[PDB]
């Protein structure tokens, strides 16, 4: 009857170990006030964006496109130095991807209107790597763990870049205490 | 948290005051960090 992650708190209702990464961790009662499907879809989206974002924050320092506008090792400098029409194109393309991938059901009243729509299941499997039944739960656990780790890592990387004015790897190689 | 206290917190004057203070704080902090915006810079 007690939460496994937080043993001095009672087990949150609507958390019953069914979803991947469920360790009964909801001390603030978000799942008692909001639906778990929207929360899982949001968690997967924040985590996937942070997976791409942490991988970018490490890789863009080491590898660049040719040109002066793509030569910033620090990612917050690359936000400003990159061509503006390209980044606006990125914004518009992300908007179109969000529009079509959710099949015109984008909001808190119409996404999951179809009963077949599963949280975080946009239908995305380009190489069909999910063709294995007993692999599925371990795959979803690995995806959500990578997403949570990526959220914490990218949050830290951005704010440490703000503190140090250094790209992450070269901050680790040229470290200066505050 | 007591459900009756949450229901009191959900009343129209409390939520009105909290939402308008939250909006005012957005306008105040935006004008603190980006003052004197007579125009949209283009």
């Amino acid at each position: 009857a007690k939460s496994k992650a937080v043993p001095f708190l009672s087990q949150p209702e609507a958390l019953d170990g069914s979803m991947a990464g469920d360790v009964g961790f909801d001390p603030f009662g978000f799942s008692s006030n909001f639906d778990l499907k929207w929360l899982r879809e949001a968690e997967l989206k924040h985590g996937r964006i942070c997976m791409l974002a942490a991988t970018g924050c490490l890789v863009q320092e080491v590898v660049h496109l040719p040109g002066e506008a793509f030569s910033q090792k620090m990612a917050l400098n690359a936000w400003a130095a990159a061509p503006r029409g390209g980044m606006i194109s990125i914004l518009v393309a992300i908007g179109l991807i969000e529009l079509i991938s959710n099949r015109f059901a984008l909001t808190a009243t119409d996404m999951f209107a179809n009963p077949n729509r599963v949280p975080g299941d946009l239908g995305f499997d380009p190489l069909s790597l999910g063709g294995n039944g007993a692999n599925r739960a371990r795959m979803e656990l690995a995806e959500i763990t990578h997403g949570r780790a990526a959220m914490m890592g990218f949050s830290g990387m951005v704010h440490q870049m703000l503190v140090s004015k250094q790209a992450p790897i070269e901050q680790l190689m040229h470290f200066k205490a505050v | 948290m007591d459900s009756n206290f949450l229901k009191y917190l959900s009343t129209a004057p409390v939520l009105f005051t909290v939402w308008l203070s939250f909006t005012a704080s957005f306008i105040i902090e935006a004008n603190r960090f980006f003052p004197d915006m007579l125009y949209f810079p283009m």
Binding site: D35, S101, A108, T109, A113, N114, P115, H174 | -
Partner: protein, 154 residues
């Protein structure tokens, strides 16, 4: 009665659709899982997409090096842009749109290649480790491990 962020319109008094299609399991290589017309995943499934991507990558190679190559007296080749190709019979429009209008690499200063990235547009790789080590460095390289060690030894 209406859980927050449930996303069911009938719980929010929103106009629903009623007709909710079943989700098929058929997958496309560069497409998305979802309801399609009959015949669709058999005509434009993964085979069609992969074949068209292969054909597009093949046809990119003459398009990437697009230009009028002219042999000189010494056997060398002079590449000049298709924008200088003039046509005899369209009035005052001697210059006409060409394949380089659709793919203007030189207008953006992009040295295109048949493998996209060219010699004067090469991907830049540089080692961030600055030629020093993880620990015990004496010079202009003070790592986080060195900071930990100096903090402990003080």
């Amino acid at each position: 009665a209406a859980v927050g962020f449930s996303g069911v319109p009938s719980q929010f008094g929103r106009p629903e659709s009623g007709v909710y299609p079943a989700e098929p399991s058929e997958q496309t290589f560069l497409g998305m899982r979802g309801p399609r017309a009959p015949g669709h995943r058999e005509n434009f499934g993964g085979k069609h997409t992969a074949t068209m991507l292969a054909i597009a990558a093949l046809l990119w190679q003459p398009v990437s090096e697009a230009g009028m190559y002219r042999m000189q007296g010494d056997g060398s080749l002079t590449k000049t842009s298709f924008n200088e190709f003039e046509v005899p019979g369209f009035g005052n429009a001697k210059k006409v749109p060409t394949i380089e209008s659709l793919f203007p690499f030189s207008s953006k200063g992009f040295d295109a290649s048949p493998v996209l990235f060219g010699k004067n547009s090469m991907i830049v790789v540089e080692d961030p480790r600055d030629g020093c080590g993880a620990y015990a460095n004496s010079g202009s390289c003070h790592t986080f491990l060195d900071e930990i060690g100096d903090a402990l030894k003080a």
